[PDB]
Amino acid sequence: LVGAMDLTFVLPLGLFNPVMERFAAHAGDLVPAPGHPDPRAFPPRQLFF
Amino acid sequence: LVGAMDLTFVLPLGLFNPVMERFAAHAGDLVPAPGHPDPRAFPPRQLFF
Amino acid sequence: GLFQEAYPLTCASDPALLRSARNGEAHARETHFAQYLVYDASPLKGLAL
């Protein structure tokens, strides 16, 4: 009666956002120290679980 | 006894807001990366269901 | 067949502007820039669907 499930998962690594959907709400929030460029604006190469 | 409703639906595609009704709220929120024009300021040609 | 009306749906023209609807009717953004939103008046309003 103690059973066993299976589940398979789908995760995207290196996608890019659709052109009409990219922004930063409630204006620019995740801002580094001045004089340092945004690491956010580069195309992503990572994930976190 | 299990019946069926019908409903007909109206959805607009190419409307533009009037002279007065267009604005932004709590000022400029949805702003793209600096050095890029707004995708929001173009006239809309889409919908999303 | 009686009223000769056709009910609107929950719909917007940009998806980022759309996502204030699923929070509820109160926190929905009616209009941000030349885009717009339409929240429904259908009798299926408060349903699970």
Automatic annotation (TrEMBL), chain C:
Domain of life per record: Viruses
Please report the name of this protein according to its UniProt entry: Major capsid protein
Which species does the entry assign this protein to?
A: Human herpesvirus 1
Included stretch of the parent chain: 1326 to 1374 of 1374
